[PDB]
Amino acid sequence: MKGTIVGTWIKTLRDLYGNDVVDESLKSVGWEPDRVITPLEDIDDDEVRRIFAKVSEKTGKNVNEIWREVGRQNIKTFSEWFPSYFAGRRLVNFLMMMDEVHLQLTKMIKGATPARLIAKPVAKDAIEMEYVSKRKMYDYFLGLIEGSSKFFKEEISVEEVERGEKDGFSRLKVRIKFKNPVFEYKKN
């Protein structure tokens, strides 16, 4: 996982559960508790997993629950940090651009198996978004959607259409319904 994002997760874990819980969890995997992670590092996914697992043990919170909340809160961090991804945009705009943004952000990562977040219109007031990846971070994904609705102050309805795994790839499809029309038919 790209360093920058892991950095944001750690800060969020601190916001959620406190510095001792997080400091201890980082040590248990051999990190300096105040380790400074850079945009160049590809942090080992297993070590992240063990960090979250340790936080789960210390807080008594379920790890899926933790990921959900980290997803929710992550959006506020992104909005204050990178205001450019949010500026002059509505929620639908923001969501439709995520796939492209993530391809840009992982272009340099050695081992090029980056998650896809392809969204497409399926009605005048609704899109389907499909998370496809090697990593199966379902709860994080859903939390991120909730965080986005929260930030843009646009109420949505989120229905999971299906989830599944095949050929090592996880897939989660959601239908997101907006309060009023955001699309119209157009000559193809």
Ligand code: HEM
């Ligand atoms: C400006 C806002 C955002 C930024 C800057 C951002 C950036 C990133 C970065 C750098 C990663 C690391 C991926 C890797 O290292 O392979 C990541 C992961 C991920 N992002 Fe975002 N993200 C944003 C918002 C969102 C939103 C709104 C969603 C969903 C609606 C989303 C879905 C995901 C998921 C599911 C992953 C896990 C990747 C995987 O499973 O391989 N992100 N994001």
